[PDB]
């Protein structure tokens, strides 16, 4: 669910987007919650830090 204002809960539980939970195993329809971003000096302005 979305955040309430000023909410910071650090979790690494992979969430199940499919019809069956994967129980913490990165598999089908169970993505990793944390996405990293490829900062580059050549990145576009919309993607620069």
């Amino acid at each position: 669910s979305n955040l309430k204002p000023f909410e910071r809960d650090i979790s690494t539980e992979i969430y199940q987007a499919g019809s069956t939970p994967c129980n913490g195993v990165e598999g089908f329809n169970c993505y990793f919650p944390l996405q990293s971003y490829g900062f580059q000096p050549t990145n576009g302005v919309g993607y620069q830090p």
């Binding site: 987007a17 499919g18 019809s19 089908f28 329809n29």
Partner: protein
């Protein structure tokens, strides 16, 4: 002129590629569209990228 149930193919989990843009995967069932084009064919594996 037909209502589409978007849960059958999303929960079949037989698809090796499922990339949706402009709409999220689990809000297809909520939305109401004017028309949808379906393009069916066979492409080699690494070409699907």
């Amino acid at each position: 002129n037909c209502v589409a149930d978007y849960s059958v193919l999303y929960n079949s989990a037989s698809f090796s590629t499922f990339k949706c843009y402009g709409v999220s995967p689990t809000k297809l069932n909520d939305l109401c569209f004017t028309n949808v084009y379906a393009d069916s064919f066979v492409i080699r594996g690494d070409e699907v990228r």
